[PDB]
Ligand binder design. Structure first.
Ligand SMILES: CN(CCc1ccc(-c2ccccc2)cc1)c1nc(CN2CCc3ccc(C(=O)O)cc3C2)cs1
Ligand SMILES: CN(CCc1ccc(-c2ccccc2)cc1)c1nc(CN2CCc3ccc(C(=O)O)cc3C2)cs1
Lengths: 122, 136
């Protein structure tokens, strides 16, 4: 069983919060979900370094989610980003452009299929 | 000259056009601002549009001696750049405006170690004076 790191925006809306709960609930089927400002950073970074997969919900813009993704890239982690185009947002070119289709994947999704996409990934 | 990299949110770009312009103009006093212009033959020498932007931005980031980030507007792109910059062992300065009413992400505020990664709350009027102090 892999160690799984989930990230999402601390400022996510009602739709985002229900989706984060759904993503985390489904990730439990595959492995262990690991998830003072300095203390928060150090603890989250320790979890990120131990992760086998980093799964980020990137629909809401967030400095923290972007930061965890940049650190995860440099930690050589396998990354899956999930973006909901029905939010009307445009995903940052830095995240869409980070994708290489293998160790860094960015998938658009409709809210109803998020568990089926996670099953496909694992 | 020291190679300086400046980043800010793309979505704030029109509203914050003048503020990012003031930071960049003051950074010019202390080094070459790598991020001010993109040479087209460099992009041609290098992929879809987003990938091209990611690659050019990562080339600027690795060339940098100092990374200056305006972190007032939440952005996945700016956070990603800061994450990659930390791992490249870059000296980083983040500038945040508490007058915006926002709470800066604990991941950015908590990343500060006092020397190679600094986060400074500022009022817009002192931004040039703050850049002078950092670069002295
Ligand atoms: C369910 N969820 C996404 C929603 C969420 C829940 C909790 C906190 C959190 C904040 C502070 C301290 C502890 C937890 C932050 C976001 C998760 N995300 C993660 C990973 N990190 C945790 C840290 C962090 C900090 C800032 C920001 C940001 O948007 O700027 C994002 C994150 C995300 C763990 S659980
Ligand atoms: C003045 N300024 C902040 C506003 C700005 C200006 C230019 C472009 C840009 C876009 C594409 C190609 C080149 C430059 C992007 C944002 C600067 N920022 C930087 C660094 N990168 C460039 C890339 C990038 C992409 C997305 C996002 C995001 O907020 O999601 C942020 C950034 C920031 C260079 S000049």
């Amino acid at each position: 069983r892999p160690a799984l790191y989930f990230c999402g925006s601390i400022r996510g809306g009602r739709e985002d919060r229900t989706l984060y709960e759904r993503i985390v609930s489904r990730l439990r089927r595959f492995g262990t979900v690991l998830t003072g400002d300095r203390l928060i950073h150090e603890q989250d970074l320790e979890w990120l370094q131990q992760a086998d997969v980093v799964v980020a919900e990137v629909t809401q813009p967030s400095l923290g989610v972007g930061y965890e993704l940049g650190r995860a890239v440099a930690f050589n982690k396998r990354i899956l980003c999930l973006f909901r185009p029905q939010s009307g947002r445009v995903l940052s070119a830095m995240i869409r452009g980070a994708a290489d289709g293998s160790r860094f994947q960015v998938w658009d999704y409709e809210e109803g299929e998020v568990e089926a996409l996670l099953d496909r990934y694992f």
